[PDB]
Amino acid sequence: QISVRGLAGVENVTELKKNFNRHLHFTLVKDRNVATPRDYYFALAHTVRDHLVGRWIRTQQHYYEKDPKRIYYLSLEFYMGRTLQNTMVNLALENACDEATYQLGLDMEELEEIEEDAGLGNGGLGRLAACFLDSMATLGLAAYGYGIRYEFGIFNQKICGGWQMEEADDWLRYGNPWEKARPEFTLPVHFYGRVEHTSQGAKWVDTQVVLAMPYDTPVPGYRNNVVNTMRLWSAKAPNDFNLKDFNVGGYIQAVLDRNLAENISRVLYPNDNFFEGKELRLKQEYFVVAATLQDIIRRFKSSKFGCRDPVRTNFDAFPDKVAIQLNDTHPSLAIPELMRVLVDLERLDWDKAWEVTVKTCAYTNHTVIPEALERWPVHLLETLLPRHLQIIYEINQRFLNRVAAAFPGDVDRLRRMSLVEEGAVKRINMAHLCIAGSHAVNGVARIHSEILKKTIFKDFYELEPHKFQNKTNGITPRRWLVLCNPGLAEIIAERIGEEYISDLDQLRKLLSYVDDEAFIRDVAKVKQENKLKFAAYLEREYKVHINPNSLFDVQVKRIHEYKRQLLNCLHVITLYNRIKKEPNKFVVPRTVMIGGKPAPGYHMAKMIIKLITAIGDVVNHDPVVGDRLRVIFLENYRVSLAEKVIPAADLSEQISTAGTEASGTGNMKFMLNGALTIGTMDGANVEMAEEAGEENFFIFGMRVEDVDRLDQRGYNAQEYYDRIPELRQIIEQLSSGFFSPKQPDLFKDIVNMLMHHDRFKVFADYEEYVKCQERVSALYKNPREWTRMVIRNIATSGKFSSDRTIAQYAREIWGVEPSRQRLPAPDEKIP
Amino acid sequence: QISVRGLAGVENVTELKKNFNRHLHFTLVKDRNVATPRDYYFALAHTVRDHLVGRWIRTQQHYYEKDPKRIYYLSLEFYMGRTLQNTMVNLALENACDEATYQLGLDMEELEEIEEDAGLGNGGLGRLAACFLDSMATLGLAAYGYGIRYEFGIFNQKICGGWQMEEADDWLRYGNPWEKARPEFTLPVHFYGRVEHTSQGAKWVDTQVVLAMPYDTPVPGYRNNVVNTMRLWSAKAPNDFNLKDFNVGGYIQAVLDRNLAENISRVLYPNDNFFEGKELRLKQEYFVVAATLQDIIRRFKSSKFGCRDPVRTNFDAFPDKVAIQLNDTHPSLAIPELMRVLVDLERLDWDKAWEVTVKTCAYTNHTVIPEALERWPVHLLETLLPRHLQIIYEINQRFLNRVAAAFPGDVDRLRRMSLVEEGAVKRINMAHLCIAGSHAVNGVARIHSEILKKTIFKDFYELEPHKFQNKTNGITPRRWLVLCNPGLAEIIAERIGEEYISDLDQLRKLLSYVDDEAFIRDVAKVKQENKLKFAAYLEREYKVHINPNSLFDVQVKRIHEYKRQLLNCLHVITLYNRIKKEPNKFVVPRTVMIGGKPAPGYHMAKMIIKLITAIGDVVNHDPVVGDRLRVIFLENYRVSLAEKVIPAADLSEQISTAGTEASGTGNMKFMLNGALTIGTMDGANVEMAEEAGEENFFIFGMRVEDVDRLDQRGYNAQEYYDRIPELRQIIEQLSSGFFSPKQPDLFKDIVNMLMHHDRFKVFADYEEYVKCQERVSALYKNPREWTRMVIRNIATSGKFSSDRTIAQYAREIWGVEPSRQRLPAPDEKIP
Numbered sequence A, B: 001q002i003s004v005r006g007l008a009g010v011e012n013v014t015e016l017k018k019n020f021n022r023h024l025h026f027t028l029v030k031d032r033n034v035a036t037p038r039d040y041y042f043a044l045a046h047t048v049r050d051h052l053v054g055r056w057i058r059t060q061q062h063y064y065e066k067d068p069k070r071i072y073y074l075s076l077e078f079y080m081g082r083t084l085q086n087t088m089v090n091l092a093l094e095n096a097c098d099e100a101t102y103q104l105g106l107d108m109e110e111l112e113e114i115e116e117d118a119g120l121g122n123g124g125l126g127r128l129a130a131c132f133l134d135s136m137a138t139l140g141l142a143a144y145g146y147g148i149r150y151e152f153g154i155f156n157q158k159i160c161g162g163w164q165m166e167e168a169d170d171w172l173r174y175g176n177p178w179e180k181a182r183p184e185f186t187l188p189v190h191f192y193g194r195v196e197h198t199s200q201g202a203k204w205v206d207t208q209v210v211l212a213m214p215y216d217t218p219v220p221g222y223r224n225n226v227v228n229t230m231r232l233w234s235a236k237a238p239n240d241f242n243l244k245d246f247n248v249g250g251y252i253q254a255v256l257d258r259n260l261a262e263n264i265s266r267v268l269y270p271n272d273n274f275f276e277g278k279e280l281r282l283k284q285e286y287f288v289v290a291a292t293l294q295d296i297i298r299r300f301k302s303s304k305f306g307c308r309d310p311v312r313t314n315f316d317a318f319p320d321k322v323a324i325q326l327n328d329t330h331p332s333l334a335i336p337e338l339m340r341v342l343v344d345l346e347r348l349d350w351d352k353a354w355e356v357t358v359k360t361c362a363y364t365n366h367t368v369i370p371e372a373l374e375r376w377p378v379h380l381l382e383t384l385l386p387r388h389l390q391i392i393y394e395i396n397q398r399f400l401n402r403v404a405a406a407f408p409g410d411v412d413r414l415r416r417m418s419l420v421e422e423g424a425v426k427r428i429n430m431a432h433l434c435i436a437g438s439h440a441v442n443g444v445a446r447i448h449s450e451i452l453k454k455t456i457f458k459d460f461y462e463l464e465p466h467k468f469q470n471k472t473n474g475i476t477p478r479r480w481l482v483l484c485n486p487g488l489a490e491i492i493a494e495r496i497g498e499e500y501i502s503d504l505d506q507l508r509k510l511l512s513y514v515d516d517e518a519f520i521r522d523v524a525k526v527k528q529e530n531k532l533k534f535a536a537y538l539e540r541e542y543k544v545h546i547n548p549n550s551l552f553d554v555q556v557k558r559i560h561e562y563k564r565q566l567l568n569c570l571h572v573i574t575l576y577n578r579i580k581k582e583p584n585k586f587v588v589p590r591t592v593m594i595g596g597k598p599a600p601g602y603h604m605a606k607m608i609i610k611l612i613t614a615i616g617d618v619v620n621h622d623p624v625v626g627d628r629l630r631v632i633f634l635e636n637y638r639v640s641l642a643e644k645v646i647p648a649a650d651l652s653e654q655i656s657t658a659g660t661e662a663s664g665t666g667n668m669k670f671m672l673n674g675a676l677t678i679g680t681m682d683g684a685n686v687e688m689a690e691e692a693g694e695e696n697f698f699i700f701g702m703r704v705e706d707v708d709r710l711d712q713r714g715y716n717a718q719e720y721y722d723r724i725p726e727l728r729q730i731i732e733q734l735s736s737g738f739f740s741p742k743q744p745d746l747f748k749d750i751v752n753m754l755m756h757h758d759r760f761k762v763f764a765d766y767e768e769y770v771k772c773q774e775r776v777s778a779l780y781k782n783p784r785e786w787t788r789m790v791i792r793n794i795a796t797s798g799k800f801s802s803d804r805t806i807a808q809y810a811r812e813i814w815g816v817e818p819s820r821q822r823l824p825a826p827d828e829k830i831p
């Protein structure tokens, strides 16, 4: 039998085929004689979507009947990936659709590769959101992910001459079978305008209006029949002031100018985190905050209140019925906006509105590196949003009065912890507005949460230590194990069962097969098959025959200086220099695969991508190197390429300067799928080593105390250049043009940076790194010992399930109890 | 029984209900507890669309098997109206859906009023196209209407203070159930660029590319199971040079700037015909021409050639397999564009390509008034389209050489009939390019076609008299009789049967009931019911209780000076002045209803709309007038309001200065539905009077000889002002402010125009008009005599069926034989 990838029932394969042909004809308006793979993909997509509308409808009615506390997860990013296989998996439908389509003569795996990725994310942030939504539905929570429906997702990367070329991601060219446009619930978002003070209230008057049309996507829980909702807002011009204030213009042009209000959801801002002070960005931010809060209050006004008991619109019970999670400072405006709707329109006292706002709101901090912090120009919030900058001033004023009452005379504290930064451009510190106005603040890994309490939010911690918490990131076992690695999920399933997909802690039962020759041959058999498929796919749809017998060494994640892909490059060049030095000496063979996208304006990231392809140019055509070493740049890394590379890797690179990667989630995906980690004590790498023991990790380099000590004495890269002749050789190979022969000067900016302005200390972790790399090649040479260190990683992945993360959020921040018990499946009834 | 509006079969009402509930749940993702009328409308729309995909698919496969000559009707306008009831009607589905929804507790008529109008038209032109497509499908023709899918149709008119206020028509807010986006057939349209001459061919190189994505709408023939296609193109940015030429810009902004190539199908140009030299217009024009011609050639390369016999791509057989009809000069570029594709890309000799182009192309002229003629600036075609302005020069050059060979020494002929007009701005006369390059040129009524041969295309006629023809416009009996007036279609059906809906000439058999008291009571009973519904609807969804016992006097059509709504106003004021003069004298009571939209920039049309509401202001609140007279301005006249007003009218106003309305089609809709016509000898009014006899019309005023005679001596309105004291009174009532009391000066521009610059001679037809109006009130007083003049109009409407027009086009221009025999209905098979 295939796997136990659901049952492939006799009646159930019949009904699927019938339904597939009903949509090819009626929905696609094709007949099997004119239909492409694409049309076949859409006929399956619609037949699978049919199976979850019954549940979606029953799940929502259900939340209205028993009125639970609802969780609204506000994220300007959700990186969802392809959703056909995830839907079949969470419904138990995958070998039925696989039997069914096979009987129609269709390879289901061809049809799945047809689907565009919903790449409405940049990377770790949007994917954490995607992974949390799958767990919230799996934990039975009344939760709604609330985002912007971008027309253009993250750009498609093209490597054109070794240089990244960006291309627009038109993911909707062919439509999306998964959403349901809900025009009926269009809502108004107000922008610009002014505040006039009646001696009764403040009114924000004279505003331009943009309409927000919701689009819902179903989020199915794993086999529990819960289908929750991801609501994404789309911007629409009002077809009224646009044609109500005329006063010269021209009719055609008043109609052309509407794609100017619709531009607010045109595109995802490509900043794999760094901050850009653009008005379009603040507008996208305010758009998802104002539209969503209207939906929250709407759903609160109805319920067991817009119906009965203590008859005033009781906002006192708002925090017990509502929880909104601010995923970074991107939705921070949900705090002066919930104060606006409460104080201005519901007319509550300022102090009572504030008690309700902090009891509702919670903030997650995702990074400590300062270029990623949102600090908005006040002339910008004054122009665009004038009531909110007034409310924000009021929050700041009353906050400092309580800080000053607690730390009397500490004038510096006050300057430090102000929401208003004075300076060249007066600005508002959005992080500070989120700690002031949330009842919980949290980091994404234990090292990061501590660093928040010890450096960046130290003063805020001293005031309100009770707010700071930690919720270590997680990954969902479904896509990141059952979906991308059916083979590995099957041999685990054989030994310990299938219940491990709702609690990955049962993977701990695998420790008992570390010494079991069948299991060691099985764990290594599937890793060798996965490596055979990714080797194949790569030739087939991209390039050169890579050796499946190499150690697949892969670093896939956004190109940044802190993530230190130039440190991995120094190691690759080191390897090539040792082969050339001693050509006829055996080395363990490697296929180094580095991939990720660079934000368009980050010139150094773009230069780093050119280095890696320039190293591929040299190494891969050296006859003396032969086959022992290959350098490959994985073009257009996205969620669906991650489901391909990560099951095929032997070594995971997680090499960030200690203290800079807040958590990482790529690192956890690689631990679940049988790759060992070489990594610094950074982010969740610390808790990963601790979970499997240091002896099962290749942890190395400076620790955070060591980066501070080094920074206090002063970091000087020249010193490493002197003491290490292999680092001398490399640097001079860069400067003189060995890797760029037609343009000797080409990598001069990287040399100079390393040498003179390296904020991330690449050179200080070089000897410990290249030595730690000698120990993993050493272990690789002993197959049986690699596979058992691997079995001790896999066996110890349970903490890293987003189901653990979410039962921690539910319980310690939202006040909700996670259930995982099947709701009734609709079967017939249309209500 | 309801009517014989199809059968309401037992199994068939069952299957419809089941299918209605399957789409409410699965397609709308609603349950009957949360579903509005709107959601009910869309569940019926999708169940009715299901019934025609089987036929659409079988009809297209069919045209490929037996390979007929195909007709491509190119129109920048199709004014389709609402399509639910037209689809139920052409499929025999209307009392089944009516039983079915009633049994679900739904008033089907509520649900039909939910549908937006596809208002992709301005008026007579787009609606003629809509009416032709219904007849082509009904006459079994392999025909495709080819247009632009505008995002914004014709603006919605708001009368705000008596002034027209325009509003954007967002007809797609809620989606369209009728189209099928066909992304798979996106095609490239080239713009700008340059021509370089290789000494082998000319290449148009360096062009910007815009993508054209097709959207198909099914056009169902009346009960013959033919479902043909209306393909509408949508503009899309290439997601490649837009992000392939960077060279400074900014990534976000390169993605925002795509709504700039997508602007080509953003909006319908609102010019109820007059001509505006805008680049966006030439671009929309070139867009539908280039995309469509790629589809024509594509479908020609395949067939019984891209398969077999005399093995070169035989363009010689192109005119025998292809006919494109140029509906006005808007698609005239189909002539240098078919020469481009043939000469530049297929490499045919110039002379051979020209024989194929004129044998394919035919041109329909729709008006003679000069402000409507397209004369494009050469610096514009040189910039935007440089190969086409070069090809056009080449056509002009070889045309004048044959003119000069036929009329030797006639240097003025040559200046006159040139495609290039010299002058201040050198220009290209598109009408002239269409007569040069088409094998048939035609007018839309016998008077208009003659006037073309005698004035405007006289020189072209003298050269090639064989080209000029006439095809008198028509209206489809289905929407304009069976759909809007089921009652009238039923009592005709009772007496003479139902076969009259495929040949309206059988209405001639009705002459036999002119003296039949049952039929005279029936014809007048349904007109009184229709007048009761339109009186009701008007209060209910708009305004004041109008008297159903009045003569409903209505003029609905675009506001222009030539259509002479100010002449109808002079008559209304005349009536009000006679009541006031002699208040206690019986007059026949009237409800005058004037309605139509004004192009946004035509200040006089906007002033005329303010006059009519200003006359409504006065008259409708005069207590002495009481109820004998009411003036109503029908706000936002569109196809669906036409299906409401036209069945409820007693008098049709068709009052154009003789020689200016080329045909009219409103006039024919009113003759089919039992209204008598008061009209000048203009357009098809001439053939309408002739069809029913002059004695059954209220024909009046100057004839065309009389407008020429008057123009040669010199038209002077002052002379009419002197001889007619009732016209003096009115003019001075306008000048002094009787109708505009707060602003006496307000109608000063209209007075001045009438008095000093009336190109359409309103004053010269005033006495004959107001006297002719005394004769219709006279007849109205004799109910039995009105209803029998009416029965002689209705009985004589057959010539005015677009089925006659199209069997004339098919046979005398396209070389096709009309069939009307049922194709097989699919019943089960999905191929």
Ligand SMILES: *Cc1c(COP(=O)(O)O)cnc(C)c1O
Pocket (backbone or CB within 6 Å): A122, A123, A124, A127, A556, A557, A558, A637, A638, A639, A642, A663, A664, A665, A666, A667, A669
């Ligand atoms: C998981 C994931 C990430 C996160 O990677 P890190 O290494 O944690 O920075 C980024 N992009 C994609 C495509 C992912 O799947």
Ligand SMILES: *Cc1c(COP(=O)(O)O)cnc(C)c1O
Pocket (backbone or CB within 6 Å): B122, B123, B124, B127, B556, B557, B558, B637, B638, B639, B642, B663, B664, B665, B666, B667, B669
């Ligand atoms: C038929 C029709 C017209 C044509 O009217 P004419 O009086 O011939 O100019 C214009 N608009 C609409 C809505 C129509 O139905």
Ligand SMILES: OC[C@@H]1[C@@H](O)[C@H](O)[C@@H](O)c2nnnn21
Pocket (backbone or CB within 6 Å): A124, A125, A126, A128, A273, A366, A367, A444, A473, A661, A662, A663, A664, A665, A683
């Ligand atoms: O918490 C989710 C991820 C973390 O895993 C990364 O370490 C951090 O750089 C980040 N920034 N935004 N989102 N993220």
Ligand SMILES: OC[C@@H]1[C@@H](O)[C@H](O)[C@@H](O)c2nnnn21
Pocket (backbone or CB within 6 Å): B124, B125, B126, B128, B273, B366, B367, B444, B473, B661, B662, B663, B664, B665, B683
């Ligand atoms: O032929 C269709 C209609 C005619 O009936 C009108 O008389 C004419 O003004 C016109 N202009 N464009 N289209 N049309």
